[PDB]
Symmetry: C2
Subunit: 302 residues, 2 copies
Amino acid sequence: DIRGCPTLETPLKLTFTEDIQPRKENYFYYDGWRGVGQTVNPWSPVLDNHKYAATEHEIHIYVEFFQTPSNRFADKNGAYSYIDANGVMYTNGEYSWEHVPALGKNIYKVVISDWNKGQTKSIYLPGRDFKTVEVFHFQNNRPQWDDRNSYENVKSRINNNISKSYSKAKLNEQLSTYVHDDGTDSLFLYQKLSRASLKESQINYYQLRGKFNGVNLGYWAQEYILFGGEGAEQLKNKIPDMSNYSMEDNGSFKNALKIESLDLRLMDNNRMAYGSTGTYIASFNRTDFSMTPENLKACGLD
Amino acid sequence: DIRGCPTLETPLKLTFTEDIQPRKENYFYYDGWRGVGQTVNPWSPVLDNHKYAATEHEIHIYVEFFQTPSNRFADKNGAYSYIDANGVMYTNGEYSWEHVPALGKNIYKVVISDWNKGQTKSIYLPGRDFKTVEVFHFQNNRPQWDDRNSYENVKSRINNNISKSYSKAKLNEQLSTYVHDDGTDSLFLYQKLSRASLKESQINYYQLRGKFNGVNLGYWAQEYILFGGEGAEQLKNKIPDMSNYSMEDNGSFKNALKIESLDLRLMDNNRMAYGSTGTYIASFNRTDFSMTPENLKACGLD
């Protein structure tokens, strides 16, 4: 018996942070979140920006457990939840979970909305002993937006339609002004956390990065989320020159009990193709509980 | 093995809330926290108020454990703490604990300051398995204020000097204007939580209520914290007519694991002695985690 270690009962947080600083090009400022603007402080959009740019962003989280969620009590602000006899989940504070039995037994859904400039969105998972967590990141003013609640249609686009890779030749193309739409999905990011087993000591993650709303000024600005995953923030103000750019991230967090939170940060990066194509980073990192070497060792987390 | 119940590892919160609404008397408004004012919205003090009234309030908490605090990790915002080899406690966020070995082994101190109108102060205890928690509530512009860090002198006043009871005849006395000071202590409230045993399932509490700064306008307004303890809020706008008024509160919270937070609220009550003496309530209540009857029973907390 060793007391005081983090356990599967200890809550795990998910954070989502908007951190896109607008990029000057000569002239106007590009910003994947709100389009293109003529001035920066304060923000002032180009003439026809409203036709193209997003004004709303949403995070939909689907959690699947191996069994009924095990926690037996709820707190004031939502760090702890429980389910009743019928499988309805009770959570207090800003967020509540919808039981979605149609998708499967032990699956729950939350929608975080009003995600604006500079904001960090935070939510506790109703259990650390999950099987799967899927996150959909949706942006406004795109044709799939009205249909964002269809889990199946979104998954279909993820599996069958969204590019897993972009060539350098593609990133260097100029879409002609005369094309009216650029084809970018409302879905701009998909995250999947998975654990192979109930008492499993690691968390696997996957991401499928997409694009932010394109804006057609007198040409076409297209906005690719070109890099992501752990430590991707260290690549800010760098675009390595290679022939293909992967839109997928893959990795594993060992010693997951040591993790306080899994953090997504969306940030700006250099522009390519003379300002015609923007690049962005979707970094996904862990912040750990602070622990001494001797407590790490004692809790088997070194 | 039953999973999902609240344990001694689950953090326990302490809350402190200022909720004194000023009372009109004909005319000016009395407010135990900031004195006497000529107008209310916004606040505007009487001529000589600064001579008498508090402008600062502080909460000093001393926690004693049965053994070294058992938690082995620290989080971002301070819900969890740990100690190192030398007994220094590590906590992140707004508050940190000072190790005070001079007072005893396993004793820690925190000072919460800047406690202003309407504010709730919240802090997690570094352990639920404590032996003792003592709270000192200090107010400004009183002669014991400079000495508020002397644990021993404060305890001496608590044991030897602060009245445990006030008579009705006393509450109905008018101190003459010609007396310059009313004698009220900087210490206006003392709380003691105690547990008789490491794995003990209840929390005992005690309070010694005092007075808020008196103000001498053309007479003497004196400010007694006349009621307190659990459910004392239900006595708002009531002063029961009896011959003595106890300044002590005593009670017990059974099933302490069910408690999310122990809540102190300071509130105004009717004035006595034709407005010369104010009364206030220091209610001390539990807010529980929400739990179904069937989870209460399963966790042995019904």
